[PDB]
Amino acid sequence: SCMDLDVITTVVKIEGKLRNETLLRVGKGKTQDFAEATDNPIIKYRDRPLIPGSSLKGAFRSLVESYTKSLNDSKYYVCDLDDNSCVSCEEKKEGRYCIPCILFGFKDLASRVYILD
RNA sequence: AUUGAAAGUUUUUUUUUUUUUUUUUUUUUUUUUUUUUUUUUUUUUUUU
């Protein structure tokens, strides 16, 4: 049973500073949406450039999916995002689990790892 | 001193989950640092 969000045993908070190595370009969801800058401007929170939490979550989920598929284990699988027939874990008689579904949630299950901006 | 009255429509329930504004796009193509100007003029290898 992977739906244990009702009972919270432990909570860990990771606080740090992210420093870009190369020329980091913000997602710029403001596609052809100028606010106070030239051409298409990167998104920012009150004139302060902001890395979207959704972007980091998507990149992390892609990395986790790649890792899980590289595991090549029957017990652990990844289901397509558009599929609505996927389930997080199966308690059929030892069971199957979805690591990205466990971490960042699915339609059937909410996330367990929250990522801030 | 209404036939005659005194009662809260109240408790209880998070509008929540799934989703990277993403891929592609070499600030390059052309243009001789050349061009007119004499390292020239003056001076006895020489006297008591």
Integer Cα distance of A7 and A23 in angstroms = 43
> Which residues surround strand B, with CB < 7 Å?
A 25, 27-29, 31, 52, 54-55, 57-59, 61-62, 81, 104-107, 109-111
A1 burial class (0-12, 13-18, 19+ CB within 10 angstroms)? Answer: exposed
For residue A76, what are the β-bridge partners? A97
Q: Write the DSSP string, A55-87.
A: HHHHHHHHHHHHHHHHH--TTB----SS-SS--
Structure token pair of residue A101: 């579904």
d(CA A41, CA A71): 40
Name the closest nucleotide to A33, judged by C1' and CA.
B21
Residue A76 sits at φ, ψ, to 5 deg, of -125, 125
Report angle CA A18, A21, A24 to the nearest 5 degrees: 80
Pairwise CA distance, residues A42 & A34, whole Å: 9
Experimental method: cryo-EM
Decide: A68 and A77 in contact? Cβ < 8 Å. Answer: yes
Q: How far is the CA of A95 from the C1' of B35 (A)?
A: 91
* Quoted resolution (Å): 3.5
The one-letter amino acid code at A117 reads D
